Amino acid sequence: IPLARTVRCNCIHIDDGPVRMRAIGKLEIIPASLSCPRVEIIATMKKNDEQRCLNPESKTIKNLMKA
Amino acid sequence: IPLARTVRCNCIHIDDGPVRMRAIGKLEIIPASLSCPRVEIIATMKKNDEQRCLNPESKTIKNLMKAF
Amino acid sequence: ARTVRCNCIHIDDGPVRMRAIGKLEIIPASLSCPRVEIIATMKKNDEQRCLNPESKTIKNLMKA
Amino acid sequence: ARTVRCNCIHIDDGPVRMRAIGKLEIIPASLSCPRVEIIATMKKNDEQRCLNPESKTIKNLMKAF
């Protein structure tokens, strides 16, 4: 809880409306790094392979992730 | 996202947890800027000075917001 | 007794550009200030001012 | 006829630290690949390799606390 930290991440906007394994093609998890002090979760929906950034801090998201 | 863009924002982690307007001492809304290309919404919970970053794209949040 | 201890002593009405604001604060009604308050930090000079919650330039603006 | 298309040819059972992982691309069990595939891209050389979905170095690495 300081000021603005300059960061470099893939995800800028984080999609909210959840889903389930059924619709998700691939799930890409990216561990926290020096450039992006947070985990990034990018799902590719079989629906036109629409890529969506999810919130790793979200309960549902956590549930879906770990199996 | 065509790639990674260098960005400078107040919010790094978005508490996509729940809430509503009991408590919430204050709610800050920072329009999208050249430095952060998406609006930030910082809530200062009535209790304990604790600050939470809310997802501006969250239906609940857009509705909690469009309620002033 | 009619009493009030709010942050705003002055309420702006002069319409303001969506892009001229740097920050916006919404402090909801309380016993100490039964009225909602919206304080904007303008980009220019970073001057803080209060906008009318009831105003359209605001209701429209509130589609942030 | 018939056909089967999994991405993995080798399954790295050897341990691995979250430290050296760039990312995981977890692919859900499909009709074409009747199991889940977890491809890791090591930080080192950006090397890709498959890890066993049912291995501990993975389950504990499956971070969420």
Numbering used by the authors:
A (entry chain B): 1 to 67
B (entry chain A): 1 to 68
C (entry chain D): 4 to 67
D (entry chain C): 4 to 68
Authors' text:
Interferon-γ-inducible protein (IP-10; CXCL10; 10 kDa) belongs to the CXC family of chemokines and is secreted by a variety of cell types. The biological activities of IP-10 are exerted by interactions with the G-protein-coupled receptor CXCR3 expressed on Th1 lymphocytes. IP-10 acts as an immunoinflammatory mediator in Th1-type inflammatory diseases, rheumatoid arthritis, cardiac allograft rejection, multiple sclerosis, atherosclerosis, sarcoidosis and prostate cancer.
Here, we present the crystal structure of mouse IP-10 at 2.5 Å resolution, which shows a novel oligomeric association. The final model contains four molecules in the asymmetric unit: A (residues 1–68), B (residues 1–67), C (residues 4–68) and D (residues 4–67). In each molecule, the N-terminal extended loop is stabilized by two disulfide bonds between conserved cysteines (9:36 and 11:53). The dimers (A–D and B–C) are primarily stabilized by reciprocal interactions between opposing β1 strands. Intermolecular contacts in the tetramer are through molecules A and B. The two molecules associate through their N-terminal loops in an antiparallel fashion such that their α-helices lie on one face of the β-strands, while the interacting N-terminal loops are on the back of the strands. The rotation axis parallel to the β-sheets and dissecting the A–B dimer relates chains A and B with a rotation angle of 179.1°, as calculated by LSQMAN. This is a novel association in which the tetramer consists of two six-stranded antiparallel β-sheets, with an antiparallel sheet formed by the N-­terminal regions between the two six-stranded β-­sheets and all four helices lying on one face of the β-sheet. The solvent-accessible area at the interface in the dimer is reduced by 1770 Å2, which is higher than the buried surface area of the pseudosymmetrical dimers A–D and B–C (1280 and 1170 Å2, respectively).
